């Protein structure tokens, strides 16, 4: 029944700096709060138990503190491998996980390296035609992808997929795909995907 109000929901800092995550409890959990690190794909990783007691094997730049209902969690000297989603978990009475906090590392701005691919002839035999466009290793995550066929914009039949932030160079990546039927595909000529001066990579046929 105990409620854990973990704030904020997201963070954004640069390498070397320190962040702080606040966890607010509904009642006195008597310093029985834990701290975990969850990377996507991996299982969560225990960092601190009993408010401040760090886990054997964790760098000293992680630290916790608090008493009663108010607790905090610091990460100094930030590194690219610290990208994850952090939770607080009380265990005074049963269990209660915090809302979570998704961490982002702030690096220098980088433009995406765009690549476009015509539909494979094996896909044309199936009656479909999908043209793919990649946007790899950019920053920040905010990017607009614009598809063009014969110069006119096409907004229906598009599917976007963002990756998580890279834990080494702190970059993102994106793959936008335009799904058209084969007859509608060959009713037009040039194909182009533009990344928002925009960046352009196209093929001709």
């Amino acid at each position: 029944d105990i409620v854990m109000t973990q704030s904020p929901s997201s963070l954004s800092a640069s390498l070397g700096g320190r962040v702080t995550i606040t966890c607010k409890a509904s009642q006195d959990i008597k310093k029985y709060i834990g701290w975990y690190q969850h990377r996507p794909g991996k299982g969560p990783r225990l960092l601190i138990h009993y408010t401040s007691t760090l886990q054997p094997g964790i760098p000293s730049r992680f630290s916790g503190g608090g008493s009663g209902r108010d607790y905090s969690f610091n990460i100094s000297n930030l590194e690219p491998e610290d990208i994850a989603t952090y939770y607080c978990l009380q265990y005074d009475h049963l269990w209660t996980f915090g809302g979570g906090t998704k961490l982002e590392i702030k690096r220098a701005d980088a433009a995406p390296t765009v690549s476009i691919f015509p539909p494979s002839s094996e896909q044309l035999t199936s009656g479909g035609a999908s043209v793919v466009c990649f946007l790899n290793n950019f920053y920040p995550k905010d990017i607009n992808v614009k598809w063009k066929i014969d110069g006119s914009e096409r907004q229906n039949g598009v599917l976007n997929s963002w990756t998580d932030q890279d834990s080494k160079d702190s970059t993102y990546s994106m793959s936008s795909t335009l799904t058209l039927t084969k007859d509608e595909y060959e009713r037009h000529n040039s194909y182009t995907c533009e990344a928002t001066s925009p960046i352009v990579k196209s093929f001709n046929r």
Binding site: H38, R45, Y50, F97, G98, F134, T163
Partner: protein, 212 residues
């Protein structure tokens, strides 16, 4: 050396029941608790319950007192959670975690890799795998790609040349068209090769490995 290997991704129709296993291979199974945590794509982490092998002790969330049931198999060091009468809101990723309850200062320790449970009435369809052939591409090195379109359910593992080299590889999260998944993957290799590069798609749910 404390590993909790959970069962693979399970697909089940709405209204059926699924059992998730969780093997321990690093400690005495009967001396530690086994926690069960539910994660939805937009709900953080929910605690389901806990089972103490060696005893029969169970603690429920009260939220899952009619849904989840925990058993144990000390003869095989595997714990089980059985979610019955699956709604669409049961579609989540479930974790088993070890809790050393020998003293009340300890919290959950080692976690499993997670078990993705999908609850849909869709039928398992294999992916139509397509090569993305690129000659007018510089950046000192070439980028290829493979397209995994029209499959259900998740997940599909995409590797290049059977595990090498992922310098390199950018696999993108699948997108659901309700209810068909498509995902793309690209790889960057130096300019000198192409000496040969092909991708390996693996859909264990449909038992189809396409080498294209």
């Amino acid at each position: 050396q404390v590993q909790l290997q959970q069962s693979g991704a399970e697909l089940m129709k709405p209204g059926a029941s699924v059992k998730i296993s969780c093997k321990s291979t690093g400690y005495t199974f009967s001396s530690y608790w086994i926690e069960w945590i539910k994660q939805r794509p937009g709900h953080g982490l929910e605690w389901i319950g806990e089972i103490f092998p060696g005893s029969g002790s169970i603690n429920y969330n009260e939220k899952f007192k009619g849904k989840a049931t925990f058993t144990a198999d000390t003869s095989s060091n595997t714990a089980y959670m059985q979610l019955s009468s699956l709604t669409f809101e049961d579609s989540a990723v479930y974790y088993c975690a070890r809790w050393d309850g020998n003293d009340f200062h300890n919290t959950m320790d080692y976690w499993g890799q997670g078990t993705s449970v999908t609850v849909s009435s869709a039928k398992t369809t294999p992916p139509s795998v397509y090569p993305l052939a690129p000659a007018a591409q510089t950046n000192s090195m070439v980028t290829l790609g493979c397209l995994v379109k029209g499959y259900f359910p998740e997940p599909v593992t995409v590797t290049w040349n059977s595990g090498s080299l992922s310098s390199g590889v950018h696999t993108f999260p699948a997108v659901l068209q309700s209810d068909l998944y498509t995902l793309s993957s690209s790889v960057t290799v130096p300019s000198s090769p192409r000496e040969t590069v092909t991708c390996n798609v693996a859909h264990p749910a449909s038992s189809t490995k396409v080498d294209k």
